[PDB]
């Protein structure tokens, strides 16, 4: 089965995404996440090869979250996703 963990994400709709690299861009994410649901905003920090995906409704956030938790592999490049603030 699963180990089972409880992070510190109660009503957080933002999701952090690292390991972007020049290879990966914003659009690639906007679409990869957009599928889950509306996207409030997307702040891609090149200096930190990361990006923050915000959702209007936690609903899409949660879904993408788990489906992103070290599971979101775009452009044959795994990405470390973690709940934001």
Curated annotation (Swiss-Prot):
Q: Where is this cross-link: Glycyl lysine isopeptide (Lys-Gly) (interchain with G-Cter in SUMO2)?
A: 71
Q: Where are the transmembrane segments?
A: none
Subcellular location per the Swiss-Prot or TrEMBL entry: Nucleus; Cytoplasm
- List the coiled-coil residues: none
Question: Domain of life of the organism in this record?
Answer: Eukaryota
Q: Where is the RRM domain?
A: 13-85
| Function as written in the Swiss-Prot or TrEMBL entry | Required for pre-mRNA splicing as component of the activated spliceosome. Involved in the first step of pre-mRNA splicing. Binds directly to the internal stem-loop (ISL) domain of the U6 snRNA and to the pre-mRNA intron near the 5' splice site during the activation and catalytic phases of the spliceosome cycle. Involved in both translocations of the nuclear SLU7 to the cytoplasm and the cytosolic calcium-binding protein PDCD6 to the nucleus upon cellular stress responses.
Subunit annotation: Component of the pre-catalytic and catalytic spliceosome complexes. Component of the postcatalytic spliceosome P complex. Interacts with PDCD6; the interaction induces translocation of PDCD6 in the cytoplasm. Interacts with PPIL1.
Q: What is known of its domains?
A: The C-terminal RRM domain and the zinc finger motif are necessary for RNA-binding.
Q: Which family does it belong to?
A: Belongs to the SLT11 family.
Report the protein name in the record.
Answer: Pre-mRNA-splicing factor RBM22
Biological source species = Homo sapiens (Human)
User: Which gene underlies this protein?
Assistant: RBM22
